[PDB]
Design a protein around this ligand. Structure first.
Ligand SMILES: O=c1ccn([C@@H]2O[C@H](CO)[C@@H](O)[C@H]2O)c(=O)[nH]1
Ligand SMILES: *[C@@H]1O[C@H](CO)[C@@H](O)[C@H](O)[C@H]1NC(C)=O
Ligand SMILES: *[C@@H]1O[C@H](CO)[C@@H](O)[C@H](O)[C@H]1NC(C)=O
Ligand code: NA
Ligand SMILES: [Zn+2]
Ligand SMILES: [Zn+2]
Ligand SMILES: [Zn+2]
Length: 267
């Protein structure tokens, strides 16, 4: 996602974490504001453009070698690759926070987990084709862009009504309502099925496989004749909106559950 999506995921997670988890994270981050997670949710996307952070570019995605829209699937050993991936990064940084939460690596580990659980839920961050859709040029509201970009940025910002941290907070409030009582309230009690702090790869692969299903059902189902030729800000946006909104909600809910397990200690 772009910055709005990551901040929204982070604000949702803040609304679901336990108090002890909030304290654990505020202490690592040195921030006890009501934006503590949202304030770091974009860091990984700045870091990756620096020499020191170049290593971490592959950690934003897992290039699933499926065949969409005909067939979708993610396989860790087939798709992660030698340079690592979102799944291998969740394992590494989760294990740093479990083993060394008071050490110097904890700060970046937590900022990576906040960001990357967001990225796992962007379907085109779970797809090899055309570098996650970066190579598919499209038109969106009269502008030339690419399919990856409209899922990261154009469509979420249209739905949220802007791009800023305050707009993200409002959007997160809307999606948090949908989880607690609204649209998602009868399905969210299944969203953490299979979660296992002792198996970060298995857990994050469930999430990535869930998001990847939408590459076939939603991202690419219209077929590339349509996608290449049609302004996607109309009916394509209309069908995409419920899907990316539910995936942003899932990302925040699952991030909170994961942070609770990372911070958890038996009383
Ligand atoms: O296979 C790829 C290649 C790139 N990206 C993402 O696409 C962004 C560029 O739009 C990059 O920063 C990167 O995180 C993916 O999700 N998958
Ligand atoms: C784990 O994270 C550290 C710090 O960012 C990095 O140096 C190391 O290469 C990572 N290891 C793996 C297996 O991804
Ligand atoms: C759509 O554009 C992509 C990327 O250039 C291309 O691979 C594909 O063949 C195009 N499909 C159609 C039917 O135009
Ligand atoms: Na056209
Ligand atoms: Zn992102
Ligand atoms: Zn992206
Ligand atoms: Zn990212």
């Amino acid at each position: 996602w772009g910055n709005l999506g990551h901040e929204t995921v982070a604000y949702i997670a803040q609304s679901f974490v336990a108090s002890s988890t909030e304290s654990f994270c505020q202490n690592i981050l040195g921030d006890d504001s009501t934006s503590y997670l949202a304030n770091v949710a974009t860091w990984a996307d700045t870091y990756k453009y620096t020499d020191a952070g170049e290593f971490s570019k592959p950690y934003h995605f897992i290039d699933a070698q499926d065949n969409p829209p005909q067939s979708c699937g993610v396989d860790y050993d087939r798709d992660c690759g030698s340079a690592g991936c979102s799944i291998s990064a969740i394992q590494n940084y989760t294990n740093i926070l479990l083993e060394s939460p008071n050490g110097s690596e904890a700060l970046n580990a937590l900022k990576f987990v906040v960001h990357i659980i967001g990225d796992i839920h962007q379907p085109l961050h779970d797809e090899n084709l055309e570098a996650g859709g970066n190579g598919i040029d499209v038109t969106y509201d009269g502008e030339t862009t690419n399919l990856h970009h409209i899922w990261d940025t154009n469509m979420p910002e249209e739905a949220a009504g802007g791009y800023s941290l305050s707009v993200a907070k409002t959007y997160a409030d809307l999606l948090t309502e949908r989880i607690k009582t609204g649209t998602y309230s009868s399905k969210k009690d299944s969203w953490t099925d299979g979660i296992d702090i002792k198996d970060p790869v298995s857990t994050s692969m469930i999430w990535a496989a869930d998001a990847n299903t939408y590459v076939c059902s939603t991202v690419l189902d219209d077929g590339l004749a349509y996608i290449n030729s049609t302004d996607l800000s109309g009916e394509y946006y209309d069908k995409s909106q419920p899907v990316f909104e539910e995936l942003i909600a899932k990302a925040g809910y699952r991030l909170a559950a994961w942070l609770d397990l990372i911070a958890s200690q038996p009383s």
